[PDB]
Amino acid sequence: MNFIKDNSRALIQRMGMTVIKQITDDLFVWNVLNREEVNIICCEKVEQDAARGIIHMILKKGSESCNLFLKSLKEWNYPLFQDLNGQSLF
Amino acid sequence: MNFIKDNSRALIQRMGMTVIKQITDDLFVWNVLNREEVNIICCEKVEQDAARGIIHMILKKGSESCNLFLKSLKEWNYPLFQDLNGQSLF
Amino acid sequence: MNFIKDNSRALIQRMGMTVIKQITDDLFVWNVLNREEVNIICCEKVEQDAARGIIHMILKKGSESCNLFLKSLKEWNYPLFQDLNGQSLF
Amino acid sequence: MNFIKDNSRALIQRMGMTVIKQITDDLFVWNVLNREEVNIICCEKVEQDAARGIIHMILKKGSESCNLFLKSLKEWNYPLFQDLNGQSLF
Amino acid sequence: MNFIKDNSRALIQRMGMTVIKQITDDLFVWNVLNREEVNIICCEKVEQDAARGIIHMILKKGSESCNLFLKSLKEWNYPLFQDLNGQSLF
Amino acid sequence: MNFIKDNSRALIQRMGMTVIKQITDDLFVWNVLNREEVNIICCEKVEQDAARGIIHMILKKGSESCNLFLKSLKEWNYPLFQDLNGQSLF
Amino acid sequence: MNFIKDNSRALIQRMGMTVIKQITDDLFVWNVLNREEVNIICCEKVEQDAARGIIHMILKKGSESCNLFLKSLKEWNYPLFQDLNGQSLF
Amino acid sequence: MNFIKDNSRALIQRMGMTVIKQITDDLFVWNVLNREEVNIICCEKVEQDAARGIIHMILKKGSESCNLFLKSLKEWNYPLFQDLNGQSLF
Amino acid sequence: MNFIKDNSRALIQRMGMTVIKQITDDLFVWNVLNREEVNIICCEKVEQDAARGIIHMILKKGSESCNLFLKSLKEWNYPLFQDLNGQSLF
Amino acid sequence: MNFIKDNSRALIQRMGMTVIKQITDDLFVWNVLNREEVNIICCEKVEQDAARGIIHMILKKGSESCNLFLKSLKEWNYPLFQDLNGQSLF
Amino acid sequence: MNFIKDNSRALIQRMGMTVIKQITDDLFVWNVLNREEVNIICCEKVEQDAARGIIHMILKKGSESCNLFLKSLKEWNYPLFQDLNGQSLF
Amino acid sequence: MNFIKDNSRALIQRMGMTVIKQITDDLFVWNVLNREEVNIICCEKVEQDAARGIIHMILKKGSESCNLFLKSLKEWNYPLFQDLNGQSLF
Amino acid sequence: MNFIKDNSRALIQRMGMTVIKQITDDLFVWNVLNREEVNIICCEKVEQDAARGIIHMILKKGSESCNLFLKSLKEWNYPLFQDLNGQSLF
Amino acid sequence: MNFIKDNSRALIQRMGMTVIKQITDDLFVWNVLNREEVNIICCEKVEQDAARGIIHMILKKGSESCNLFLKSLKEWNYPLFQDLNGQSLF
Amino acid sequence: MNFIKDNSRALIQRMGMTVIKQITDDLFVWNVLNREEVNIICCEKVEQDAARGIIHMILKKGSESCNLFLKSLKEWNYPLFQDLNGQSLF
Amino acid sequence: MNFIKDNSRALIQRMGMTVIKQITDDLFVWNVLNREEVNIICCEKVEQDAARGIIHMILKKGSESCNLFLKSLKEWNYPLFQDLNGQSLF
């Protein structure tokens, strides 16, 4: 997927730590993240480092992992997702 | 948005804890804040840390989230908002 | 405003609970206090804590809020106000 | 439930402390509130903080807890409930 | 309603304890006050605190509760009501 | 003023309820007491609590309020005043 | 156990801090939690972080620890448990 | 005991302050209430808050404390007790 | 000691705030609690959090501290103690 | 001083609210209590909480403050003082 | 300054919360404390933690800040100050 | 020892950070770990890396170090140990 | 010193956060702890991590630092110290 | 700039966490700090590590960044700044 | 490009780790860096080694890669860029 | 210098990370350490590796660098320094 990669600047800089943890939780439940991968994203004291961890990880895990990432990103951080897609807020 | 950022000094130092919680409530109802984001703003025992949380969060969430922030800021803490805009009290 | 701040020692220690509630009422009517801010000043079982609440709050809310504070302070607790300004009682 | 959430602004700002305690009592009797949850709602010296406690709590506890909340809200604070639903007073 | 709020200074300072209890009674009969709300207004040893209780309570309970408040206020304390409205005594 | 404070033991224990109400009346007429402050001194079912109310209040209101307090105390309860000053009865 | 894991989204977002502490207490008494594990769940200023702590911890501690977790979850937060199992409130 | 809990709505709203004080006295004599617990029930200026205090307290103190509570409740406020049990007045 | 730990569920949920403060006082006098430990137990606005504080603290302080805890618990909250030990009320 | 501390159980449980206020007054006049400390002891609706406030406060303020405390305690509540010292009533 | 540091044991354990808030107020007025520093000292629910906050803060802020601290400490908590300096009470 | 090695999958993935630190502490006290080895296990921000550190280290240190490891593992994380040995929870 | 090390299990698990902070304060005053070392012990949200910090630190700082540690440990947490030394409570 | 570097000992050891956050805020608004740089200074649980972060960062960012740093340092922590410059307090 | 090379002293010594990671991110999105090259820059525990990695890498990748490097360097670390170009801060 | 080298065992094992960072800071200010050398000492996640870095570095940098090292070591970690020199604590 290119949408993550193309906007990975914004995604790294804008996804809250909360958003990252929650996406991570959904992804763990959906069996695209190892508990270690979860813990390594979550252990970063810095937001943006956790963001880099998750983004590069998901990009390496293929189209479907990326689709799931964007699914839960839309759910948990709808404002950012709509802003990235040039869409308004509803 | 730059108005938040440019005045973020004053906003951090002057928004009451009340003002922060109330803005947060409006924003949650308006679906720009995750309940976790709400709880993390609200859990800060310090006013100004809650203020930093909300401000940086909203700045990361784009123009529309910032507009909504300023909308409810005007409502709930009209004196501060008018003072920031160099306006009198009505 | 500096008059509040410079004399905030005396204001905290000397404004009666009554004086605080009444100032608070005028300020609420004059739309410089949120009902929550009112309730939080009023809920302090201690006089001086209510005083601190109102004083720091008004200082954060700018010149005009401070002017209104001193207006109603003069009205409701004229003796204290005149004593702070080095004035006699009329 | 969305009715609570959509109107949670008004509910936080308008439910009296009495209304909150009484709803809490009904809900405890109806076994949707732990005695601790009761005590934590009740221990807030501020009305609106107790309101936030109960509202977010009930929203997390699902549709049926929310229905019971609105049931007792209608009973104990009928005026507010009718005003929220755009209804007159009978 | 704004008439209560705008004149809440005068209403707090001028409604007799009697006037407050009687308004409260009418309002209880008219089902805008919980017996607890009645008891909490009535238990204030201070007139003006009871006044604050009733006024803020009714303001939170909406337009119709406020209209009923002013109805019975006109009945039981007609002099004050006419003085607030800039009217003479008949 | 120190005379009130130094003798506040005796003043609390010895000023009759009558003496307190009357001093309060003079002070209200002389515009050092808010009607609420009057009502709060007067509402104490206990003499000595009313005494504490007035004494601490006047001490907070400065030298001139204290002078007026002692003026009317001399008038209305001359025996106590002379006993405090180590003076005889005339 | 999969029930915890499959619903861990809801469990993280919905278990009150109270519910977490109480489950933790039962589990400590039942000797599936070290006092440190207790303190680390309890020290999170954020509800959902405490929830993540307990959930991942219990999942790592096996079937029986998970069964005990769900036992006390049913006791202390019966509404949530029934909502997760698609059951009504009794 | 469930009878107290199930009817705690009615008990909170209907036990007179008198009834509460008297039950409290019997319970103190019967050594199920600490003098502090007595004073804390009695110090509530509001009836229903005293009622909540006693009810939750007794529920926490077990079956026998609850039985004694209902014993003296039957004695001192027989009408309420019979109304709760669906019984007539003798 | 295991009696505290085994029943710590009940002890947390049932010891009144009064009971906790009083036990704390006895324990401070008996030199098993630092004044800070006293203040930290007492500062919890929630009963059960104060209970957790004292219980975990005393468990960490050994057999004799636990024995003293149960001694004063028997004194000040005899009903609970007898209920925990499966004993009747005398 | 140890006499206060050793008997602080009895002092907390037995000093009347009156005794506490009066001791507090003497101590304020004797310049060992800040008016705020006075107001905080006096604002406790519960006797024993006021007692705890004064006792811990005076213990922190040293030998001489404690001596003055016991002086006025002997004066105002001579029966309790003699009972604590194992002395009869004269 | 060494006097604060050498006696910081006693200062932490003995300065009342009141004393801390009042010193803090004087220091804020005297422009050695940021409003945030004020709020962070004041937000500690524990006395001694607030004490640690202020003490370490003032020690870091140099000789003159420490001198001002001791000035207002002498004013507001004269008994403690004299006890630390091995002086009697006047 | 083979029990560690054979189950090292589970041990790496399931031992809490707490469990690791505590085992490490016991082992340091029992003189099978250098303070550096302690610090290197403890410095891993990731649980599982700390787990790998301790496990491989202990395996290299022989039968007795492994026996001690399993001893303290049984103590501090009894649930995991029993689950690994196919045993129930007591 | 070996007494700390041999009992460091118990010391880590049993020293209250209070005990740790207070020991730390004494040690800072006694010039065996850098203010940073103080802040790093104090910043641990977990009790036992603060305990590990102080214990390993003091062990590295030699016999005299350890003696001072045990001195203040005896003072501030006498019960634990006596329990470790197999001594009773006095 | 050399003033920062020469006094970086004192600056690291004396700038409060508050001072650091506030300087950081001004600098972010003044566009000498990336939001990540802000978050990395702010995420240090230790004051002095945050201080090191900001100081070394600003030194690397040149004369003008250093001038701005000292500007806001003078504003927010005037006492420290004057002490470093060998100046008194005004 | 020579601007990078000529100033590579300053660039190595002054670009924050943050600046390096962010430039790296932009460059990866702009398809001048392989994910491995990203990971190798990012894996350096030392700032300046990461700086050397990126600088030499980009110099080898030609004029356009260097132009993009300087583009994002201007964006993310504008102060350094302006200082290198002998320009002021805007 | 031989004192460092001869005791480098103890220095590596006993200098806290804090002590190392602080020495490093003094040495950087005193122009015996390159900012890179600072960052490389500071980047070691392990205390003792940072210690080795600084010690070997300073030994290579000659007598005067070693003298400065021991100067600041005496300042910041006086206990260790006195223990190494066979001296007591003052």
Coordinates of N, CA and C in Angstrom, one line a residue, chain K residues 8-80:
Chain K
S8 N 15.5 20.5 56.3 CA 14.5 20.1 55.4 C 13.7 18.9 55.9
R9 N 14.3 18.0 56.7 CA 13.6 17.0 57.3 C 12.4 17.5 58.1
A10 N 12.6 18.4 59.0 CA 11.6 19.0 59.8 C 10.6 19.8 59.0
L11 N 11.2 20.6 58.0 CA 10.3 21.4 57.2 C 9.3 20.6 56.4
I12 N 9.8 19.5 55.8 CA 8.9 18.6 55.1 C 7.8 18.1 56.0
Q13 N 8.3 17.6 57.2 CA 7.3 16.9 58.0 C 6.4 17.8 58.8
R14 N 6.7 19.1 59.0 CA 6.0 19.9 59.9 C 5.2 21.1 59.3
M15 N 5.6 21.6 58.2 CA 4.9 22.7 57.5 C 3.5 22.2 57.2
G16 N 2.5 22.9 57.7 CA 1.1 22.6 57.3 C 0.9 22.9 55.9
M17 N -0.1 22.2 55.3 CA -0.5 22.5 53.9 C -0.9 24.0 53.8
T18 N -1.5 24.5 54.9 CA -1.8 26.0 54.9 C -0.5 26.8 54.8
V19 N 0.4 26.5 55.6 CA 1.7 27.2 55.6 C 2.3 27.1 54.2
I20 N 2.2 26.0 53.6 CA 2.8 25.8 52.3 C 2.1 26.7 51.2
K21 N 0.8 26.7 51.2 CA 0.0 27.5 50.3 C 0.3 29.0 50.5
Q22 N 0.5 29.4 51.7 CA 0.6 30.8 52.0 C 2.0 31.3 51.7
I23 N 3.0 30.5 52.0 CA 4.3 30.8 51.6 C 4.3 30.9 50.1
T24 N 3.7 29.9 49.4 CA 3.6 29.9 48.0 C 3.0 31.2 47.4
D25 N 1.9 31.7 48.1 CA 1.3 32.9 47.6 C 2.2 34.1 47.7
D26 N 2.9 34.2 48.9 CA 3.8 35.3 49.1 C 4.9 35.3 48.0
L27 N 5.4 34.1 47.7 CA 6.5 33.9 46.8 C 6.1 34.2 45.4
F28 N 4.8 33.8 45.0 CA 4.3 34.2 43.7 C 4.1 35.7 43.6
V29 N 3.6 36.3 44.6 CA 3.5 37.8 44.6 C 4.9 38.4 44.5
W30 N 5.9 37.8 45.1 CA 7.2 38.3 45.1 C 8.0 37.9 43.9
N31 N 7.4 37.2 42.9 CA 7.9 36.8 41.7 C 9.2 35.9 41.8
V32 N 9.0 34.9 42.6 CA 10.0 33.8 42.6 C 9.3 32.5 42.3
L33 N 8.0 32.5 42.0 CA 7.3 31.3 41.6 C 6.4 31.6 40.4
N34 N 6.5 30.7 39.4 CA 5.6 30.7 38.3 C 4.3 30.1 38.8
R35 N 3.2 30.7 38.3 CA 1.8 30.1 38.5 C 1.8 28.6 38.3
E36 N 2.5 28.0 37.4 CA 2.6 26.6 37.3 C 3.2 26.0 38.5
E37 N 4.3 26.6 39.0 CA 5.0 26.1 40.2 C 4.1 26.2 41.4
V38 N 3.3 27.2 41.4 CA 2.3 27.4 42.4 C 1.3 26.2 42.4
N39 N 0.7 26.0 41.2 CA -0.3 25.0 41.0 C 0.2 23.6 41.3
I40 N 1.5 23.4 41.0 CA 2.1 22.0 41.2 C 2.3 21.8 42.7
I41 N 2.8 22.8 43.4 CA 2.8 22.7 44.9 C 1.5 22.4 45.4
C42 N 0.5 23.2 44.9 CA -0.8 23.2 45.5 C -1.6 21.9 45.2
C43 N -1.3 21.3 44.0 CA -2.1 20.2 43.6 C -1.8 18.9 44.3
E44 N -0.7 18.8 45.0 CA -0.4 17.6 45.8 C -1.4 17.4 46.9
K45 N -2.1 16.2 46.8 CA -3.1 15.9 47.8 C -2.4 15.6 49.1
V46 N -1.1 15.4 49.1 CA -0.3 15.1 50.4 C 0.4 16.4 50.7
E47 N 0.4 16.7 52.0 CA 1.1 17.8 52.6 C 2.6 17.7 52.3
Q48 N 3.2 16.6 52.6 CA 4.7 16.5 52.6 C 5.2 16.5 51.2
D49 N 4.4 16.0 50.2 CA 4.9 16.1 48.8 C 4.9 17.5 48.4
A50 N 3.9 18.3 48.7 CA 3.9 19.7 48.5 C 5.1 20.4 49.1
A51 N 5.4 20.0 50.3 CA 6.5 20.5 51.0 C 7.8 20.2 50.3
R52 N 8.0 19.0 49.8 CA 9.2 18.6 49.0 C 9.3 19.5 47.8
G53 N 8.1 19.6 47.1 CA 8.1 20.4 45.9 C 8.6 21.8 46.1
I54 N 8.1 22.5 47.1 CA 8.5 23.9 47.4 C 9.9 23.9 47.8
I55 N 10.3 23.0 48.7 CA 11.7 23.1 49.3 C 12.7 22.9 48.2
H56 N 12.6 21.8 47.4 CA 13.6 21.6 46.4 C 13.6 22.7 45.4
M57 N 12.4 23.2 45.0 CA 12.3 24.3 44.1 C 13.0 25.5 44.6
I58 N 12.8 25.9 45.8 CA 13.4 27.1 46.3 C 14.9 27.0 46.4
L59 N 15.4 25.8 46.9 CA 16.8 25.5 47.0 C 17.5 25.7 45.6
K60 N 16.8 25.2 44.6 CA 17.4 25.4 43.2 C 17.3 26.9 42.8
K61 N 16.5 27.7 43.3 CA 16.3 29.1 42.9 C 17.2 30.1 43.6
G62 N 18.1 29.6 44.5 CA 19.2 30.5 45.0 C 18.9 31.1 46.3
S63 N 19.9 31.9 46.7 CA 20.0 32.5 48.1 C 18.8 33.4 48.3
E64 N 18.5 34.3 47.4 CA 17.5 35.3 47.6 C 16.1 34.6 47.7
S65 N 15.8 33.6 46.8 CA 14.6 32.9 46.9 C 14.4 32.2 48.2
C66 N 15.6 31.7 48.7 CA 15.5 31.0 50.0 C 15.3 32.0 51.2
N67 N 15.9 33.1 51.1 CA 15.7 34.2 52.1 C 14.2 34.6 52.1
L68 N 13.6 34.8 51.0 CA 12.2 35.1 50.9 C 11.4 34.0 51.5
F69 N 11.7 32.8 51.2 CA 11.0 31.6 51.7 C 11.0 31.6 53.2
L70 N 12.2 31.9 53.8 CA 12.3 31.9 55.3 C 11.6 33.1 55.9
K71 N 11.6 34.2 55.2 CA 10.9 35.4 55.6 C 9.4 35.0 55.8
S72 N 8.8 34.6 54.8 CA 7.3 34.3 54.9 C 7.1 33.1 55.8
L73 N 8.0 32.1 55.9 CA 7.9 31.0 56.8 C 7.8 31.5 58.2
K74 N 8.7 32.5 58.5 CA 8.7 33.1 59.9 C 7.3 33.8 60.1
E75 N 6.8 34.5 59.1 CA 5.5 35.2 59.3 C 4.4 34.2 59.5
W76 N 4.2 33.3 58.6 CA 3.0 32.4 58.6 C 3.0 31.3 59.6
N77 N 4.2 30.8 59.9 CA 4.4 29.6 60.8 C 5.5 29.9 61.7
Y78 N 5.5 31.0 62.4 CA 6.4 31.5 63.4 C 6.7 30.4 64.5
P79 N 5.7 29.6 65.0 CA 6.1 28.6 65.9 C 7.1 27.6 65.4
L80 N 6.9 27.1 64.2 CA 7.9 26.1 63.7 C 9.2 26.8 63.5

